[PDB]
């Protein structure tokens, strides 16, 4: 479908323009071509951000096939640089040693290819104890073992994200059908304790109210420090105008003026905490897949 990709690029360019980002065809088009065979059956969403990432729109294609190595695919098509850094060998170790059943890719309309995601099934989640054995894992995973076990999340890794551009990795917890992160992680006492322990900014009232609604968390780690760099809470909802946040103008426009109607999850909103403050993210769902409802929680 020549004109399926052309139509998709058009959606991408218009959506970027709603959040005041100029899309680069030279970055996007090679990627759409490289993954053309897995786009129709993927879940596609478009994510805007506040803070420094406000200069790009992330395009996410998830729930791609089990047999796909999306990093290998990107490398073969020249979309991401060949590297000797362990970031470039981690995905293969993850897929071999954790029960990974699907994957995903992220690219910026201006930045190009940036991340992969590796998804276990809700029936069999990943473990920090599996991750620490891998030759390419960040030291920070083992360094933070006590944190993961304290909060009861060490055996419920629901996604592994790898950012090739930043050389970081995200570990996600929650979000699967029948799965739960422990309740106390979302209550004010816990939110304060977690951000305190991790040396992150104290939670704003906005974050505290937002956390009440959350059932997914993720931590970002790097290879160059033992410290968790950020801790993010996410909320799924069809009614993002009802979230207890002061929405950025670009976010209001993406909600009201996207060139499509949202599907499935509709929206996934995130508030990231770093050592220096907080920033917000919102993902608007363009293409959903019904078969994913068996694996992922999708009402909000
Ligand atoms: Cl499959």
Author numbering: 3 to 302
Authors' description from the paper:
The overall structure of EpzP belongs to the PT-fold family and is characterized by ten antiparallel β-strands that assemble into a circular β-barrel. The β-barrel houses a solvent-filled reaction chamber in which the substrates bind and the regioselective Friedel-Crafts prenylation of dhPCA takes place.
Moreover, the EpzPwt structure showed that, in contrast to EpzPm-SPP and EpzPm-nat, the C-terminal portion of the enzyme was visible in the electron density and found to seal one entrance of the β-barrel. One of these, the C-terminal 310-helix in EpzPwt, seals the reaction chamber of the aromatic binding site of dhPCA. The density is indicative of the presence of an ordered compound. Although we were not able to unambiguously identify the nature of this compound, we conclude that it is inserted into the enzyme during protein production, as the shape of the density does not fit with any molecules used in downstream purification and crystallization experiments. The aromatic substrate dhPCA was docked in silico into the active site of EpzPwt by the use of Vina. However, as crystals of EpzPwt were not reproducible and other crystal forms could not be obtained, we were unable to prepare a ternary complex.
